[PDB]
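Q: what does this look like with 1,2-diacyl-SN-glycero-3-phosphocholine bound?
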Amino acid sequence: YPTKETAHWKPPPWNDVDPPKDTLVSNLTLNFGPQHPAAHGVLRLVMELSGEMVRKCDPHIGLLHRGTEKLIEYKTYLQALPYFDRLDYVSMMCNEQAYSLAVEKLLNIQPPPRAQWIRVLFGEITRLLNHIMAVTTHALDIGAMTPFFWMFEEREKMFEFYERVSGARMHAAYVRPGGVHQDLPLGLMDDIYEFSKNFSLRIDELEEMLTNNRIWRNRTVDIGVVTAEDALNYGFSGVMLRGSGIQWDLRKTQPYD
Amino acid sequence: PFFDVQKKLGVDLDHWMTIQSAEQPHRIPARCHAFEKEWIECAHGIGSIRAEKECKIEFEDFRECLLRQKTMKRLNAIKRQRDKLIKEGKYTPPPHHSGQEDLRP
Amino acid sequence: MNLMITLLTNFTLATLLVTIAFWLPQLNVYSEKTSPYECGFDPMGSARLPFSMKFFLVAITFLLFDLEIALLLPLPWASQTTNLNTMLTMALLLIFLLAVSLAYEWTQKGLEWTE
Amino acid sequence: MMTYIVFILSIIFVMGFVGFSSKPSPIYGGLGLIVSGGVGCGIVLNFGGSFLGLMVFLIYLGGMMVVFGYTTAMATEQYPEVWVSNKVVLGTFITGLLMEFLMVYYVLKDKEVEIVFKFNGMGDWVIYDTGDSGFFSEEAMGIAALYSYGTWLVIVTGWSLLIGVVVIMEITRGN
Amino acid sequence: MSLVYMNIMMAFTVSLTGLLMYRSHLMSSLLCLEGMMLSLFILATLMILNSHFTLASMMPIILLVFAACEAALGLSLLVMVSNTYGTDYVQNLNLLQC
Amino acid sequence: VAAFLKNVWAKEPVLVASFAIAGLAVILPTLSPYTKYSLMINRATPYNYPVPLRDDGNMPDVPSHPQDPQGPSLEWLKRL
Amino acid sequence: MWFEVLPGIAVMGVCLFIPGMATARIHRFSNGGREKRVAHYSYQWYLMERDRRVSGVNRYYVSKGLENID
Amino acid sequence: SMMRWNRERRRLQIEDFEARIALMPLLQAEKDRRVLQMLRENLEEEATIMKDVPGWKVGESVFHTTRWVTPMMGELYGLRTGEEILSSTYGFIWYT
Amino acid sequence: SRGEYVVAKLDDLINWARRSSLWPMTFGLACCAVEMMHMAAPRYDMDRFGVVFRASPRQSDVMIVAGTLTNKMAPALRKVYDQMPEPRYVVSMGSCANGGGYYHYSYSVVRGCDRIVPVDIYVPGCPPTAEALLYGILQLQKKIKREKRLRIWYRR
Amino acid sequence: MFMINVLTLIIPILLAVAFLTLVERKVLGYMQFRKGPNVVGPYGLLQPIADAIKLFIKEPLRPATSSISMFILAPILALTLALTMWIPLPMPYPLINMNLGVLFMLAMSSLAVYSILWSGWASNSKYALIGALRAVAQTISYEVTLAIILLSVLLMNGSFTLSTLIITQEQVWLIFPAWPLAMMWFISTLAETNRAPFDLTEGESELVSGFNVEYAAGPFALFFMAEYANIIMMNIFTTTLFLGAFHNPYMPELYTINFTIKSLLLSITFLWIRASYPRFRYDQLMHLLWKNFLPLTLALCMWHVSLPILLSSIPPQT
Ligand SMILES: CCCCCCCCCCCCCCCCCC(=O)OC[C@H](COP(=O)([O-])OCC[N+](C)(C)C)OC(=O)CCCCCCCCCCCCCCCCC
Ligand SMILES: CCCCCCCCCCCCCCCCCC(=O)OC[C@H](COP(=O)(O)OCCN)OC(=O)CCCCCCCCCCCCCCCCC
Ligand SMILES: CCCCCCCCCCCCCCCCCC(=O)OC[C@H](COP(=O)(O)OCCN)OC(=O)CCCCCCCCCCCCCCCCC
Ligand SMILES: CCCCCCCCCCCCCCCCCC(=O)OC[C@H](COP(=O)(O)OCCN)OC(=O)CCCCCCCCCCCCCCCCC
Ligand code: SF4
């Protein structure tokens, strides 16, 4: 018997199963902003999460956009040389080497052999500095802070080498187009030899405290797996390619000095 | 449908708990074990109608052991009359109810 | 009686330090100091939104296992009985039923988190 | 006044019950039920059963924290009516508190009230016992005798809990 | 009887009127249900400890065990309800009216 | 069944140890002979008061003094 | 060297030495030169109040020997 | 080692329980006499208070039997001061 | 008399307790952040002086601006400075935070962080050495020691 | 003279909390190739005083979007729960002798979580709610295994009384017949006290400062001394459980000094654990106490139920 109240009463479905009526689930949008020890200085990760599983990451960058490559155009080559120290402030001398190699290729001149050997040796020293900072800061982000203080003494020793050879601890402005700015002071290579003698044991104790710990393994065994094809397609280079199984290295395939 | 299985099979599942006068761990007696014993033995095998007619005295005495209505009622009467007598001024408490009397043991 | 004196002493020790931490120093309160902290930027929505939880099944079985261990705590007194074989059998059977429930959850992927 | 200790604990018990039975917000309902569980543990501890009070306190604290996680996941809104934020919640809280204090004043004046049963006016120290318990605690020995007497109770409780795990796992399946 | 019984049953009646009048939140009614079971626990153990029924001391543990089991069942049903609709409001359970 | 035991000890040794410990705890009170001594120790603990029986005249087994020879003694609890 | 933390460690040592020794001395003073009675069960409580009643000082640690009797 | 020490502790526990059992009759006699004396003191003062109230009979038992019942806590300490109330009723539970 | 003596002693006490418990927040942007955490290395070890990092702005005392302050960063820096409870102190590190440094004429670089926050100590260099930053921290401590807040209150 | 006893219990524990902050900062300096605070005073003995005075003259900073009642109530509850935690601990005589002290610690361990939860909820922050739900998950991970470990250990004691735990191991240490239970107990109290590698609540890397990311000075110090009192008493609880010392009723100071040295060494090992390992995930911890500790604990509970029946070694309950 239909009435006024029983006017919108539809019959139930034949299978008694309703459509799911999917309302918006209201994912929480967190802001992993720049004032955060996890973000490397300035990184505004706008992060859409379902509680804690990540659904979307949008890293807003440009908070450290100084506009280097316009002031470079407004200055000469020697004046634009210190601009390359401050791009990668923990791999400065390799940036100096890249800029010098580009300018030397454009100028059709080559450095002397001693400048080349000094360049390669100090590039390896800079690689040591960068890898120390990378591994120790990754461990500090995970939670193990002892290797950071353990190897930053060695980082201070290589900074002392930088200051002895150039007069500045970080931004040396030492590798220039045409070679290097100054010759090595006397007695530098012996101290390099002592430091290289002990650094194997330093790496050994860092590895012993990190590479076998099951808490360290659980945070790294199946995290951020990248296949080889997407590593090639996304423009990944270096350690990502070599860790995904791609046998690629610029020091072996397209060699310099 | 009280399909009584326990007496048919000979096992007991909740018979040891159902009354206050059953077997206890190292024979700890309840407060009204004797009254429950008297009421239970008064009204065994006579049915519920004859239980409420012919064991009213035992049951009401047991119920007074359980909740103690009349005991606190008499205590309330004594307490109220003593307070009114104290307030009016016709009574003084004895020294052994005041705090010291060189107690017995 | 001594426990309530101890609890009250602890409570008025705790509330004395808070009350002297709110009225003593000089205050400069503005409509920027008390904003929520979102790593330097303005938040995108409220903090009272539904924060969805993935470990709901583990919480429900935490209730059930908390009650299982609540049943299990009379064991030091129950070891002082005379019917020792029946007590031992019921203790073992209760713990075995707890382990059976845990194993059934383990084999059915109940402990694995959703999404 | 100190003879009315269980009376004061029961008045805090009813105060928490009417605080959380107004249903303001399940966070504050959780706080109210935590208060009620703690003071109920207190009440049953002055009656002698310390083990039972500690168990009910521990069990309710665990359950209340899990359900707090649930309402932070599920039962929450933009502006939770914590208290005083809604008219009906404040009205029913005040109504319950006024009714409770009214009957407390009534029983502390006539020393006898009749709501459907009949309740006496003195403290509950009168209904205690003057004897000793010897070298054992009655409640601990009863729950110890759960294992040696109550085998059927153990069987039905364990089976109910195991199938309860099965029930909750086959409920949250989705298909 | 004693006035502690008055307050315990009065708390039970408060939580009973709380459960039977909904406030558009199912979880609050679940909390009222746990309040009622807590009141039953307190009342039972008060009389059991007063009358020295020592064998009945195992009972309120079992009662609270089944209380928590039915609470867990209620929470699971609430997960299903909140996974169907946006929220846990009791007015959304009105499909069975036609 | 030896290959399965080797595999499960190679993969999850904690579950193997737990299963071994639980099996040990289940099957040891059946075969051990010291449990009856525990039963008698629990039985011989005097929680209550040993109320005496009225001497009708025919009860020579029950003693009349705690230092009488007849009755249940606890020498085995001293020796064990 | 590594023994310069030992000032703070020794300060923690005496700070944890303080409360236990304080409770021991307070228990030994407020109970007539003896250990505090431990009343776990009601039999011990009844005995303690029995001493409280026989002592006649309303202080149970005042202990009457067999010289009280005739 | 734990087995040896636990068996020794059980022997010591049995010795303590035997000492308590030997002490029981004297304490029971004093408890009976103290309870009866306190009931007689409460009854003798009950007549002095109840003189004006009509329809009252002193020493009335609320039970229908002549069997001796255990004295209620309020039937013993009903007329005494609150210090004894707190010392007897809640005294053991509150004691530390 | 006696009141000036009492407020001078109280000023000395609170100045010592504030200058010996500086908690800087974990805040860096650029090269100068690497030099700051090289000051926190075991060679110099600012934890000796009671100086220990605290990541949240609510539990920090001194803000160290180390790096280049761009236009996209200035509202975030200002907000984080505002959420820091009183008393708060600001130390400027490097030429970027001092006056823009290399990128003074850049279109998207704030010429000095003093346009945004009130700065107490300016530490010059590019990067200033770890000894230079420790010198700046000790200068800030000595500046805190010379505060006469309760003396000013008593005189006013 | 009970109030004097209460004061002489509650003042030295917070003094030792401040000096534990000193010692922790010094050890956390000295393991990582550097020094601790040694500038403020003679070998840095005045650093906790300076920290304490500094935190009580800073701004209180109650947020506008936060519910003020629970915001103020939570640190009071945290400090009071840490302070009443210490009451039945026998050193060698507890402040309050209790028949069931172990269940009192368990109930107050359940209650102390609520301070963290309500401080996370009241401060209207997403990071605070994240820290609160991580605390919830941590509690539902550890609590069952903690209670059942303590149950299966106390079966050889005979009762829940802590003073009986001195007598029950006066011959040999209780760490010998329950060494696996000792290790899982140590891990469970590492997880209970929110210390590394199971921090997961005050994470300075996944979050900024956790549930107290909005708490300014003063109220934040309440959580600091609450946590440090928690770690000291939990090491003391472990020392009483497994490392009981020789007790002379005529000279209690021998037991006090033995117990104090053992608990100090346990706290040194606690800070040693702090500066050695990376932090877990908050779901890897849930798969640790459930998939690895709980089955072995159920097996050990079967073993420790059957074993006193096996060897006729049932301890007295008196
Ligand atoms: C207080 C006194 C001292 C306490 C001891 C501990 C002090 C030293 C602490 C060291 C640092 C610890 C830092 C935190 C570490 C947290 C991680 C962790 O421990 O995880 C647990 C780890 C977990 O291992 P996992 O994380 O590698 O798990 C792998 C899991 N799968 C395979 C699924 C990937 O270990 C355990 O769970 C073991 C628990 C203890 C087992 C004890 C067994 C005792 C022996 C039994 C018998 C054996 C013989 C054979 C059978 C015989 C039968 C008769
Ligand atoms: C009878 C003894 C008493 C029994 C009752 C008391 C038991 C106490 C212990 C309770 C344990 C509860 C949890 C059990 C879970 C078992 C199922 C399971 O989860 O297996 C998984 C595991 C392989 O791991 P995986 O598949 O990777 O798991 C997913 C992520 N871990 O799978 C495995 O590792 C294999 C599991 C099955 C085989 C175990 C064999 C153990 C043998 C020990 C020696 C013999 C002991 C004597 C008794 C016979 C036992 C079979
Ligand atoms: C009516 C009469 C009373 C009037 C009110 C005043 C009462 C006393 C107030 C407290 C003491 C006030 C004086 C404070 C120190 C004054 C002198 C001073 O500043 O000395 C500086 C000196 C360190 O020199 P610095 O410049 O740091 O050197 C670098 C290292 N080469 O510093 C040092 O060498 C060490 C300084 C230590 C300061 C004292 C110790 C700390 C404070 C203790 C008391 C307050 C706290 C009590 C407990 C609170 C709860 C924990
Ligand atoms: C709004 C937020 C909340 C704000 C207020 C917070 C208040 C403080 C909260 C923390 C404390 C909660 C305490 C809860 C009850 C704990 C009971 C307890 O500790 O019992 C231990 C002990 C057991 O005694 P037993 O082992 O039997 O030995 C005696 C035999 N001679 O017992 C004894 O030794 C007996 C000592 C006397 C006991 C008296 C009865 C208990 C008093 C409870 C007072 C109210 C507590 C309210 C807690 C609210 C928590 C939210
Ligand atoms: S001042 Fe120099 S060293 Fe510092 S951030 Fe700027 S460019 Fe880098």
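The beta strands of chain I are 62-66, 89-93, 121-123. The longest strand of chain I covers residues 62-66.
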